[PDB]
Amino acid sequence: VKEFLAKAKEDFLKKWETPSQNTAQLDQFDRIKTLGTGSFGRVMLVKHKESGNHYAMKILDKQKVVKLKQIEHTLNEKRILQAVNFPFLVKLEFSFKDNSNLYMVMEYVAGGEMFSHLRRIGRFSEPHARFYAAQIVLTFEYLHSLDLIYRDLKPENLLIDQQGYIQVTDFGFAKRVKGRTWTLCGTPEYLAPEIILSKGYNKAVDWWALGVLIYEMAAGYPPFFADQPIQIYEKIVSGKVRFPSHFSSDLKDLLRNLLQVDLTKRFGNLKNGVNDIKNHKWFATTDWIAIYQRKVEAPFIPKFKGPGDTSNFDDYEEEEIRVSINEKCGKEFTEF
Template identity: 60%
Template sequence: MAEAPKEKMSFIKKLTISAKEGTLFKKSNTVSPSTASKQVSNRGSQSNLAPASKPATAASPSSATSAAPPSASPAAPSPSKKSAPADVDRAVDPAKVATRGVNPANAPPFKPKGKYQIPDLSIDRTLGTGSFGRVHMVRLKATGKYYAMKVLKKNEVVKMKQVEHTINEKNILEKLDYPFLVFMLGTMQDSHNLYFILEYVQGGEVFSFLRRSGRFQNSVAKYYACEVILAFEYLHCRDIIYRDLKPENLLIDSKGHIKITDFGFAKHVPDVTWTLCGTPDYLAPEIIQSKGYGKAVDWWAFGVLVYEMLAGHPPFYDDDHFKLYEKILACKPKFPSHFDPNAKDLVKRILTTDLSKRYGNLRAGVVDIKCHKWFADVEWQKMEDCAIPAPYLPPCKGEGDTSNFDQYPEDHEPYGVTGPDPHKDKFIGF
């Protein structure tokens, strides 16, 4: 590998140090290409599911390939003024990829979220843990409905300088209402913790499904990719950058649709931002180089996601963060022989360091991606309406089923404790 310019190396060193300190970066449960190959080899067919999984309900070709256009709606506003390159290859008429829900004018009126207290909830088992706290399944006593409660320790949030990100997360979740994004019921706080009461998604993480499968069949990866595209289109139309796409942050609901969760790095960005944050394997080159960046970083991460779903491992991998960032900047992904040619073409058009050529960042924005030949058989309005059967139905025994999540020790401190709150002024109105 050619030696990177010294000025870029300094950026990489800065980012590597930040990642080791864990201040603005999250770990990713990625596996090396060699490990992924062994997983697939040991399982045989790439479409194998875990024994507990229900038989996949595959979407028939006819269900997604009808030539009839979806209901007409205004195209989403372009996120970039860059001109499309001469080699743009559209397989679909742009007028046929518009969907209703991505137009901000169609958004439902803003409804303030509810305020709750710990006594309003029955707290069940832990679904996941992190450096700031944990997530529980809870039941709202007034309705009997199940939700997920994300608990963040105030001391840790302040110590790790995540106050602004946490406030951003609350403010953004309050305004979101879309099929492929986790819905927030409300928030609350006590003297020690912050609480998000969120939609409970029973099916577990796409990450878990992907690791069990080794890698996804082309049709499965395409299905999830479509739902992520629609979610990003919805967010970007509202000038929200997500900045933390990865299989661990994609949940699967009981009907097989994805729900993007964890908006801790999401931010309202009408123009550009400079914050160094994300998950190392999914960082765009412009973040690594400490450049101002915008919505294009989400599309880079989307290209990484598509590659990982089809290959079983990310395109750029190294245990050493320094070398990982070098590989990202070099941007020379190697594609396995089984990779679908159209998917390969799309990933190559997205994973480019040249922002003037990156799909999603051209004049037509997301339209270039939705019109790409890999998605030629997709009916986007039906996809948004959840009218196309999902390729995988997670085992689910009921609304309160937690079998798709790992077990964790219940060693947390009591919630709802009153007492001195040295950080009260930092979370006013939470």
């Protein structure tokens, strides 16, 4: 994979250095329905007029971006997204801006969030969990090799495509950094203890998050939960983990190594890096090449109606998309 990654970095760097800009405009799309929301924006199902293709259009109010102090994070998101390429990363198809909004148009992944299916089904069996986990492992290997840290892993940000494979979305907290960084960001249940403790951290926080995701997929609930974020952080920092009775010995050993408070001992962060995870007994049945090639048969295939079907997504309250005749925050988002 060393020769693959070296070429992958070469491809990535060209686009990182000279980013795509202004590859569409709003009136090229008909907005249909909201697919999901986050603290500052919504993702809408749209239909592209000239092609007839459906896409997921992420809309960011520039004023809200600024208010929540997310200018650099939003610039990060777009710059990274337009430069990456991997089978399990949602593709950015177009991006643009107008007087009021930033727009990131992605491929529409109709199978819905892993979150919905996980909560509905209750929990995934270990092979089912392993199938998804493997894709995240390879994806993080790819991202980290590019000096990228992801920082927002959770079932809400993992979409199931028509083949039952994972598409990672939401690069809102993604950042290109060599060495450590300090921003307190992510989702409380998925925060590594070094994020909470404000001491600076590196890509090993993504591996901790992988442990949290694997646990939640396999248990049906997270390893650290409570009614309030501050209560969750207390449990994370204690580091005490308890496993369901049905967890295999192999799964528990892997999780102890991922949910490891000690950075000199956390899997993924050691001398042999990602190979400590890839070669773990829990992944013994995993053909890593077959996964990458999408040749492994998926355990779950979302019911797929029409190309613009949203039946795998919850309904959200709609809201008009406003565009002022006055340009807002022009200089701030010049590079977008």
